Symmetry: D2
Subunit: 367 residues, 4 copies
């Protein structure tokens, strides 16, 4: 009755998934998932990390992980370029899929995966972990309850500086063919996942983009950076409401600055992921005490009580992934819907690729 887990990849997100699967029942109860197969290359690395992560075995063969009869669900955290192949193989093998963002490098690959998921009758979720913080889920509930009235404006950014150093070498990830989008693919899609959760679907974008560092060192020479370092867009939501949107991988001093704000007719909500335990809420008050409230994360907020009964004991980035694992567990058990599945994920892919198209063509793109 325990869920059988396969994990492909052991990097930033691979180890994050491994830590989540290990403690999901500790936090939320029920049966601890069985950690069956860890796939990674080379073989000696898969064997070492399988042992320390507590997987029953490691293998250099990713298809072993998706085909084992003892596996019910596959975490896929490999580079963007093999997401489509591995996800479709896992669905064809009758496995549920936890796929790291983005879905694939192109809308066309994401469309094929979306059709494959519908055909499989298996649960899918995409790894948009910034939608899982108690603060973010609390903000969505406050908007649903009318805490800020009708939303009238969204302003969101996602700034990091991991590519700011012009000496960082060229890679496949910086080509259109093998890397897909740049900052829009790495960061933009995260901001879309948060933005559409707050404001509903996107109807129109008008975008601009820049490549700040256009060429990088490559094996004693240099190679051209083909995707964007930063992008900005004006949004019209299906509601008719306005939005401002940006992302950057060259914004010096920022490490995880996914920051957003919803302005409403009766209040304002504001958040910055670099301080993920604070949610700022303004509602009209009598003039003597009027001002924004600092809501510090605690057991009043979704998910937090599963990890800690004491408010102000800071919730961590990695615990977002434990919440994500639990949402997929509950969906597989038919006790909840996981968001976003491959259908809702395809919509997010269309928005970021539409922003890329808009920036290139100088035309607004409608959805």
């Amino acid at each position: 009755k325990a869920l059988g887990v396969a994990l492909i990849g052991t990097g930033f997100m691979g180890k994050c998934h491994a830590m989540a699967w290990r403690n999901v029942a500790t936090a939320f109860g029920g049966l601890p998932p069985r950690l069956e197969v860890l796939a990674d290359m080379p073989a000696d690395k898969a064997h070492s990390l399988a042992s320390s992560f507590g997987f029953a075995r490691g293998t250099a063969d990713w298809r072993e992980a998706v085909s084992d009869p003892a596996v019910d669900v596959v975490s896929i955290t490999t580079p963007n370029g093999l997401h489509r192949e591995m996800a479709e193989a896992a669905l064809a093998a009758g496995k549920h899929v936890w796929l790291e963002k983005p879905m694939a490098l192109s809308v066309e690959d994401a469309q094929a995966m979306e059709a494959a998921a519908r055909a499989s009758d298996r649960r899918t979720i995409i790894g948009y972990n910034y939608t899982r913080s108690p603060a973010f889920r609390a903000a969505v509930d406050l908007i649903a309850e009318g805490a800020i009235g009708r939303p009238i404006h969204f302003r969101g950014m996602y700034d990091e500086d991991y590519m700011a150093d012009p000496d960082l070498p060229w890679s496949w990830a910086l080509t259109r063919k093998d890397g897909g989008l740049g900052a829009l693919g790495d960061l933009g899609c995260h901001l879309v996942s948060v933005m559409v959760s707050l404001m509903g679907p996107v109807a129109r974008v008008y975008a601009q983009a820049d490549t700040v560092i256009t060429d990088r060192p490559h094996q004693g020479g240099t190679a051209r950076v083909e995707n964007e370092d930063q992008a900005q867009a004006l949004i019209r939501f299906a509601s008719g409401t306005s939005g401002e949107f940006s992302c950057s991988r060259v914004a010096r001093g920022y490490r995880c600055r996914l920051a957003w704000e919803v302005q409403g007719t009766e209040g304002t909500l504001r958040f910055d992921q670099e301080r993920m335990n604070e949610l700022w809420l303004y509602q009209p008050g009598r003039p003597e005490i009027d001002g924004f409230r600092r809501i510090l994360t605690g057991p009043a907020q979704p998910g937090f009580a599963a990890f800690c009964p004491g408010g102000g004991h800071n919730f961590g980035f990695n615990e977002q992934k434990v919440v994500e694992a639990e949402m997929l567990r509950q969906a597989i058990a038919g006790r909840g819907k996981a968001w976003p599945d491959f259908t809702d994920g395809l919509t997010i892919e269309r928005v970021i690729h539409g922003m890329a198209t808009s920036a290139q063509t100088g035309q607004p793109v409608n959805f």
Copy 2:
């Protein structure tokens, strides 16, 4: 040789200008300006406020005030619809002009005022006071010294909520003919004054705008709000750099949130007017101590030492206006160039009206 001052209006900016003229020599030295004539309506209020503001006389006739031979410079702090008439009369009478923003209701009006100012050979400055804080002036100098390398992105906002209450009555300020622009005219022009001082001139805008409260109480019933409560724009600068721009008069909880950020190849500068004594600077550092610095306003920043020798003694909004007065004083004496004059101001008017045009047409607007 002391400057003779006429002040028209005694409200938010009228009292701000009066306080600035009274302490400009206290802060910066030289001779205190002579406070000659205060013009306001009705007469009884002009007489009352001339006495408490320390002007030699009050009048209900602004035309007599700008024509007084004892007057050298005119502060104009009246409503937007009166700027063109009063500025043109002041320049025609051979007076230097300190004009509140925005210049007028239309680009056509601003163009006529710009021509009148050049024809007069008198100094002009527009009341873009957010360019006068020690933090802002320190940021411009840091960019000039290459402290953040080459600017690659600007993001700016100016949020206030003074029109957020839907019960606030309709006024002539909310008509296009008598009010001109909405949030772009009240707040947007301030953000442009700061943005172009940091990033240089605007080449292109693509904008969106909304009226979120479309009808307000008027007499027994309601009247239509014709101008925007909020606007946002993507910017392309003449330098080729990108920008994000917004303003709002309905952003709940914000009172004076003119906030901006310049991202460069070698650092980032960030500022919020609601904490006008803090400038955030990131420059790459060794990993053990890497992070943004909180630069607290003190005497190392332009203008501050004229007000206080001790750092961290917070500089105030009103003291921006004393700095503005000193810059006009020095321009009149021929010891400095005042920014923005009516020529520089006209460019700012074209940008905010260009953003309004872009929002109306759904098309980008180019300036160069």
Copy 3:
């Protein structure tokens, strides 16, 4: 009819007082005080600053300024060792007195000044300007209204780093005989003025102190620093409530960090002078929205509306002094009581000297 003003000193506080006297009627109405006599040394400095500050004349003789028949009130902004002589002379000459903190070098000095003020029947106020911010005055009113219930704890600090550099030269301010207390005299008295305004009178202190830099450069040689660089104290108020208290002139990175909080049975108030426009208020709320409010200074808070009708337009350090001037004008006109007068100031002197005594002897000190 207008108040005649003498100003002694033109430094940090001298120029602050001059700017306050120049705009007090601009802000609060009535007749602008007449700036009659400025005293400073040397004479040509007094003449130059009298001209730029708008005083009718300058003199190198402080006794000339306090004795002038056109003078009704004297601002005394000279070094601490001169306060007693100048305040007693001004009171003897029948002048009201605006005296900078601390009162003098000793409790004995303050007792003599307190007696002289009662005998003179003139108004006195001491320049505890941190009690004048809209945020501070709002906090006092909130406590009185029961906004935080029953106060149960005070914690206050006043950190600055103006003496943190060991190569900063020795001065006569660093002897006990000529300079009095160290950080307790420069900063401690400010924190006491705020603390007793929130919590009421002090009943008992137990204090510790240190001199961190005991020797400083003196004319190519070295000389001994005799007074404390930092001090900390536990407080019992007359109410029986507990307090924590500290001050430091060597706390690196702090410029004006007068910060306090009052914890109560139904809320908490917290403040930091380096962000003097923010007051933090916690009151119990429904769990979904529970948290501290950031109250941004605006016209709802005492004094602010006299300077600006727009909330979030930051009130400045110097404008605290315009409020202080207005409180003295109103006390002179018999329309308000100024705090603290020399009687209430003597109590503050007893508290800071009791803390110094406690730190010296390792024993608690009790008051009235």
Copy 4:
């Protein structure tokens, strides 16, 4: 692999269980074997052993600490049970991870400290605020001379879990069954951080108050006997000054363990409610002079074991994974665990000395 017994399943019980489950995931080596979980009643012990992934649940903690498959015992039970359970675990030849404070009295802590030395087993006490990357980074910066010589410490630990007068009385508010109040709940945490930054305490002078003196009990009222808040002036063995406070009645504060070290060449400042930020001032040229916001990332001790990217906030619970790893390494003879029962007993003497100073109105020397 290490065999683990866990006693208790509450706030710290679940925290320890999550730590033992991911310590090898984060730091490598063999995952500890989760052998026995002890809790009452037996149905709760069985259901939580199942969800926590322990091989068996028992309502008898004594046979859990005696199990031959157990090498180390996590003790997360109420304060009054610490002495009995730690002494039994040491006597059975087990390593001990004990929650703070050690016990209700110095007498009890003295007995536990002797038992730990008499055994050749490792001990560590759950002072988990010493485990954050920001805190460990601050200790390293001080040792490296980044702020020169410490000249002042100011620390507080404010929470409001007892601030509401409506909150009912409990046995924890008696001296006999509860021991100390705010000093025992929060004060000992602040001491663990303070002595790690400044070195040992030489002297305290303290004040304490019970500000809500009676609470609802069985439709009547019962007396609160221990302190709601306490403050102390400190002298360290170094001669340096300190300020210290704790409170369980400080409205609006949830986990406000906040401290500051002022030095001859800079200042370090930290607030646990923003546990991923360390504020460092060092003198700079006037145009750029100011405090640096150091955001937690892989440059700080422990962080890289959890995440390769800076600014991905480290959490309260991950402090406990670091604590587990330090105990693992100490059991393997590859590091000393701090604080053991000897170093823990010093902390107990400091908080009990503060309580005595407040009661007698006299300084207490150590």
